């Protein structure tokens, strides 16, 4: 399949080179996989989701995304126009309030919720979780992310936006998950992206067009935007049978575009997520 005039980040993850605008992907498009978006919620009624999105848990008085961030992330995972895995099922877990913040205890509870809830969902090709959140180092937050990954979910987490070593942030610093840095359309490390030996992969994170609340769209930037590109890529690859939840991060790193990013500090991977699709 070919989607012309796609958002630059979609075009980038199916290209060996920057500067193109068509997204190429196998038409299976993540069908039969599931992605949990653990964030501010998802505006499921948005047509871009085509009935494939649903809120499954909230820790607040409503399950509505009153912020937009979770809707944007979900859109990069799996919206029809802005998504990597255009046929995946999307499940929203609202651990962040409408101001975009959440207590670590609530975030931990939402991770444990996903580890159990996947047993209530039909995801024959596999389960992914996209965590575009984080704060300072917490061993409890890291151990919750580790449990989620151990349960058989491919966990993708944002590296953080501190232009610092991700070793000091959670869940970014949990070794066993897939920690995602951000790049821009000219293949630079995004100025704000964290770095360090705990990163597994980079994805597009600067000026990312996706869905927003009120049935709208907008471009925004962050490692929060890079993470759902990798989560959607994992779902896509698991539907194609190329990898499994336990192996997807390594598979993505093995098949990534290698050595092509600028402003990568010594000791940080220079790997950019790539779907290797050959039509």
**What residues are annotated to the active site?**
39, 69, 224
Of 177, 192, 184, 194, the C-alpha closest to 262 is: 184
Q: Is 200 in the site for Ca ion (CB under 5 A)?
A: yes
- In the bound state with Ca ion, the residue whose beta carbon lies nearer, of 34 and 154, is 154
In the complex, minimum distance from the CB of residue 78 to Ca ion, in angstroms, rounded to a whole number:
23
Contacts with Ca ion by CB under 5 A: the residue count is: 1
**Residue 1, token pair as written in the block:** 């399949």
**ω before 171 within 30° of 0 (cis)?**
yes
Strand partners of residue 89:
34
- In the bound state with Ca ion, the residue whose beta carbon lies nearer, of 98 and 200, is 200
Q: What is the DSSP letter of 118?
A: G
37 is in an annotated binding site: no
Q: What is the DSSP letter of 259?
A: S
Q: How far apart are CA 14 and CA 279, in angstroms?
A: 11
Contact of 103 with 48, CB cutoff 8 Å: no
- In the bound state with Ca ion, the residue whose beta carbon lies nearer, of 43 and 200, is 200
In the complex, minimum distance from the CB of residue 250 to Ca ion, in angstroms, rounded to a whole number:
9
16 is in an annotated binding site: yes
157 is in an annotated binding site: no
The piece of 40-48, 156-164, 193-201, 216-224 that touches Ca ion (CB under 5 A) is: 193-201
**Residue 100, token pair as written in the block:** 């975009």
Catalog residues that contact Ca ion under the rule CB under 5 A: 200
Task: Point out the annotated binding site for Ca(2+).
Answer: 16, 175, 177, 200, 260
Task: Point out the annotated binding site.
Answer: 16, 175, 177, 200, 260
């Amino acid at each position: 399949a070919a989607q012309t005039n796609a958002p630059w980040g979609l075009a980038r993850i199916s290209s060996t080179s920057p500067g193109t605008s068509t997204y190429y992907y196998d038409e299976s498009a993540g069908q039969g996989s599931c992605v949990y978006v653990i964030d501010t919620g998802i505006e499921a009624s948005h047509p871009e989701f085509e009935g494939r999105a649903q809120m499954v848990k909230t820790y607040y008085y409503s399950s509505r995304d009153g912020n937009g961030h979770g809707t944007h992330c979900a859109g990069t995972v799996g919206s029809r126009t802005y998504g990597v895995a255009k046929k995946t099922q999307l499940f929203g877990v609202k651990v962040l309030d409408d101001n975009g913040s959440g207590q670590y205890s609530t975030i931990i509870a939402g991770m444990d919720f996903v580890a159990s809830d996947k047993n209530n969902r039909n995801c024959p090709k596999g389960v992914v979780a996209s965590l575009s959140l984080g704060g300072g180092y917490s061993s409890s937050v890291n151990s919750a992310a580790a449990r989620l990954q151990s349960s058989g979910v491919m966990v993708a987490v944002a590296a953080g936006n501190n232009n610092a070593d991700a070793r000091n942030y959670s869940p970014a610093s949990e070794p066993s998950v897939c920690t995602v840095g951000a790049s821009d359309r000219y293949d630079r490390r995004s100025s704000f992206s964290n770095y360090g030996s705990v990163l597994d992969i980079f994805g597009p994170g600067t000026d990312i067009l996706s869905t927003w609340i009120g049935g709208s769209t907008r471009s925004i930037s962050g490692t929060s935007m890079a993470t759902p590109h990798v989560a959607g890529l994992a779902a896509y690859l698991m539907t194609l049978g190329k990898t499994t939840a336990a192996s997807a991060c390594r598979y993505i790193a093995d098949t990534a575009n290698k050595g092509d990013l600028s402003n990568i500090p010594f000791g940080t991977v220079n790997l950019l997520a790539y779907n290797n699709y050959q039509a």
